[PDB]
Structures are given as C-alpha cells and as structure tokens.
C-alpha cells in the first residue's frame, strides 16, 4: 500500500498523530503538492515527493530504481516543462494579449510576501520554482490570457487564489510514474489518494482508493469524510488504511 | 531669462538623443540663458544621459541643484543639493499598500517588479530599466484596465494624488512641475534672470509647466494648451524653431 497525500491545504495534529502512525507502521505516505521543493523541503518532508502540480518527481538519492538525473542530495524526475520555458512562452502570450501577463517571476518576494501574506523567506521559496508559474492576472483579462497561453503551447490551472500555467504537469502522471519507480512492485499495486480540492482530479483518478476530505463537494465516486480537514484525514487513516494491515 | 524643458519628445528626440537640439541648446549656451530639463524621469535617468544640475525629476517631486548653488537649499546628496518637494518614495508605497486594501485588490507597482519585468514591460534594456526603478517620489503603477476607477479612487482616500504618463498610471503625493518650477525660479542665484522663464513641452502632461512660466510653447503633435505656441514642427525641430523665433528676439 502506497498514500499519496496532496493535502496543502488540509496537512497544515490529530493529523500528525495519523501521519505517524503510517510511518511507524512501515506504509509510505508520499506528498504531493503544488509547493515547490523549496517550499517542502522547509517543511522537513523526506522523498519521494511530488512537486508543482505533477511538474517533478523528487527522489532519494539513493533510490533503487535508477530514474532521472542528480540535482543537490535527490534524483529529479522531470515531467513538465522548466520554468525558463514556461517563462519565455508567457512573454510569447503577453505579446499576443497585447496586455501585461505578470507572474511570480515578474515580482519581488516582497511583493509576493505581502500579496499571499506569507513571509519574507516563505516567499522567497514560494518563488523558487522550477516548473509551474504563479500568475496575477486581472479578472477582466483571464479569459483573453487564458486563450493566449493555450494559443503558445501552454497549459493552465486554477489554483483556489491564482491562475497557473505549465506544461506537462500533472498530478496523475506524477503519481502513475512514481509506482511505476516503486521499489517494491506488492507494496505499490494499491495505492490511496487522499485530496481536499477538486483540481485534485488527476491524483484520484490514478489512484485505487480515492477520498475527498475537502470542504467541497466531492467528486461523484470518491469516498469522503463525515469532516474535511485534519478530522477527515485522521478518520480516513483510522477507517480505511490501518485496518488493511490487519490482513 | 530660464528656459525649463521637459525631456522625452521635448528636448529628446525619437530615439531618446538630440537632433536639431544641440544646435539650439548649443546657440542658448552661447548667449548665457541656462537650460533647466523637468522631466518625469528619475535622477539615475537623467545621470545616464550626462545632464548637469539644476534639474527637477519624477514630475517635479524633487529638485536637484549643484552642490555649490549659491543659494542654500535642500540637504546634501553627494554632489547635489536635493529639495524635496513630493512625498518620498517609501512614504507612497506605504500608502499604496493601505489602497490595496481599501481596493480588495492588488496594486502592483515598479517598486514590487524586478528591473526584468520593467525592462520587458517598457522595451527598456535591463540597465535602463534598474535606472527607472529607482525611484523617489513617484510611483509607476501597472493596473489592470477594468480596476484602475476602483484603484484611483482608493490612491484619493489615502491622500495620493494621480497622474497617466502615456503608458503608465503614476502615483505620488506634491510632485508638480509646475511648483518644482516656481521653487526653483525662488531659488534662482540671480532673480533678474529668473524673472522671465520659458517653457517648452510636448504632452498635455506639461500642463503645470506651462502654467508656472511667463511663456510656453509646445512642440508636441496634436493641438495646443488654450494660451500656449506652436511651432509648425514637434520635438528637437520645433525647439530649434521656438529658440529662434520665440527666445532669440528678446535676448538680442
């Protein structure tokens, strides 16, 4: 059994206890997030994980399976664009929008410090990204932007603040690609996602168990939780995965 | 006699250099008559193109003298004297920040973009663009069309004061040409030379220019300000017309 967790806005108690429990029990939890690997590492979370929407697969150093190319202590997996490309196809689009097309790129940590209400230095690792861009787009301008980005090659997201474009990020793929870099073929033919956002389509639908523990509504055929949140984390842990290893 | 000469189309031509220009500033040298630019453009701007104090910057929110101006003014800046006449620069982003709240929306400016975006947003080269960043007074803001009623509304309420450059909305608070002109015209070393000033401009931003001279002349495109001169040509090539025919007769 394998969990993926893309919990941004839920893993951040009860929670932590869950989370423990997991690992105590030798059952891998692998995040996946929209944060880039900055961002995580600041978070103290150990690889696998899965960065920028499905952009790229980090793994330990010594994984293994042999996958992607060393960058600092991990293996990088790249599966979407890099950010310079990413970037010079935006230029590409606000030249066809006749308009300013501004991202995360464009401004200081201080502007997204004071724009997220992050601080400082967590703006500058929301900044530190490799594959997906944060834009700031105006209301009134999304539409015509949106059909720019699509007319350069380029693919976007909505992130529950903030549009965001990429190219070949996504969580699914991430997900399929990782288990298929899995160590241990057993352990890794069931896996679980656990997600709290509708944009985390791609992650249920590649998974063999798939919960909502968002605030939303969930998606038609993914279980959920009586609570969202931390609680629905916890009671999905406590219901539907430590049983399993009563078997 | 003063002339005050507004830069960008004025005095510059369509590369940002001299044209006929030199001819003309060269002929106002010769017959002693200073030449003071008042610009939208910053110090660092101005440096880069070798201008000497006196010069009034970003839209008349500062002026800049020569160290040994025989008048004392301002505060020491290296080899300047710098009266300050706008609100400083950190003053209205402070305030730009409160607007943004009042606006429930972001309001972006210079100040939060890298010299990259400046560059890429105005044509600029990246050294140009670090120039136009540094900026002490005036803000230039990048807003989104449909919201810019909501945030000029919301730069009034927090005591900003507004202006459009073209491209640009433009945030600051006391930054005039107009007032930059009468102040400096007060600051003159010789007040019989400062009693009858010109001034030339191109844009209907010059407005306050024109205003605070005894003679203004515009060398821009369209039509003229009511109560200013035209010169059947724009840019350098009208201010080589203007010098000739509007200054020279009454300094001969």
Do not use: Q
Request: aromatic fraction near 8%; hydrophobic fraction near 40%; include cysteine.
């Amino acid at each position: 059994m394998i969990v993926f967790t893309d919990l941004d806005g839920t893993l951040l108690g009860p929670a932590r206890e869950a989370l423990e429990r997991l690992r105590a029990l030798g059952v891998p939890v692998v995040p996946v997030t929209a944060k880039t690997r900055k961002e995580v590492e600041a978070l103290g979370l150990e690889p696998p994980f899965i960065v920028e929407n499905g952009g790229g697969l980090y793994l330990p150093r010594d994984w293994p399976v042999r996958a992607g190319r060393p960058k600092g202590g991990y293996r990088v997996v790249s599966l979407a664009w890099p950010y310079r490309k990413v970037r010079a196809r935006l230029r590409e689009a606000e030249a066809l929008a006749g308009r300013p097309i501004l991202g995360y790129g464009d401004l200081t940590a201080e502007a997204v410090a004071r724009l997220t209400g992050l601080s400082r230095e967590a703006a500058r690792r929301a900044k530190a990204r490799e594959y997906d861009e944060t834009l700031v787009l105006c209301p009134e301008e999304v539409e015509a932007v949106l059909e720019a980005l699509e007319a350069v090659g380029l693919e976007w997201t909505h992130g529950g603040r903030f549009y965001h474009a990429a190219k070949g990020a996504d969580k699914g793929r991430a997900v399929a690609r990782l288990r298929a870099l899995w160590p241990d073929p057993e352990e890794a033919r069931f896996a679980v996602g656990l997600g709290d956002s509708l944009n985390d389509l791609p992650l249920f639908r590649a998974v063999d168990l798939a919960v909502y523990v968002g605030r939303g509504d969930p998606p038609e055929g993914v279980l959920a939780t009586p609570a969202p949140g931390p609680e629905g984390f916890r009671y999905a842990v406590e219901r539907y995965l430590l049983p399993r290893l009563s078997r």
